[PDB]
């Protein structure tokens, strides 16, 4: 499965914990999410 990614619209502030991002992303109708260690954004993921 190819995975598509988009920045979270609902995650507040800086992203350090993947688990928190994942929770917000699932509520956004994605299937997961992770922090970009780079820019500290929550990135939501789902199958393309």
From TrEMBL:
Organism listed in the record: Solanum lycopersicum
Domain of life of the native organism: Eukaryota
Transmembrane segments: none
Compartments it resides in: Secreted
Protein name, per record: Flower-specific gamma-thionin-like protein/acidic protein
Part of the full-length chain shown: 26 to 73 of 105
Domain Knottins-like, residue spans: 3-48
Disulfide bonds: 4-48, 15-35, 21-42, 25-44
